[PDB]
């Protein structure tokens, strides 16, 4: 009865897929393609958040 | 992408979060 099971269902439905085996995030796209953001870099939390949201809507 | 599914999902989530 964990609320984390349903939260992950919600987060995945956004089209954001965690791929920690490759230290990266997959963003389902505007054009119907896949955007991949690495996490093994010096990217700030602010930039990564901006990058992700910009690719989820029109 | 279905209103019945979002309805039951948000019913399920509010129930688990409130408990």
């Amino acid at each position: 009865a964990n609320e984390n099971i349903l939260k992950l269902k919600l987060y995945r439905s956004l089209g954001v897929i965690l791929d920690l085996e490759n230290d990266q995030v997959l963003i389902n796209r505007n054009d119907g393609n896949i955007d991949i953001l690495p996490l093994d870099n010096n990217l700030s939390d602010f930039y990564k958040t901006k990058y992700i949201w910009e690719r989820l809507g029109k | 992408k279905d209103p019945n599914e979002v309805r039951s999902f948000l019913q399920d989530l509010s129930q688990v979060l409130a408990r």
Partner: protein
């Protein structure tokens, strides 16, 4: 690990899913690092779009309700709600 995955999604999206403040039927979606904006939703039939911060105009609120009940798209609701709350701050 589910809780660790949640923590990571919260950090990446700056989107936190919380219980409703007012009622047991509400889900509160909080956006931003400082939790600067939020919106509550309910599917108990009394209403769909609950309270929000900043509060939104009727046209914005009608668009959000339509995205949930007409298009049934939870993702598109969060993207639009986030845009509206950030633009209205």
């Amino acid at each position: 690990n589910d809780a660790a995955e949640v923590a990571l999604y919260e950090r990446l999206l700056q989107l936190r899913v919380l219980p409703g403040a007012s009622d047991v039927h509400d889900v509160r979606f909080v956006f931003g690092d400082d939790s600067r904006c939020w919106i509550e939703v309910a599917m108990h039939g009394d209403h769909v779009i609950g309270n929000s911060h900043p509060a939104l105009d009727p046209k914005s609120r009608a668009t959000l309700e339509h995205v949930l009940t007409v298009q049934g798209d939870l993702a598109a609701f969060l993207v639009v709600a986030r845009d509206m709350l950030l633009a209205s701050l």
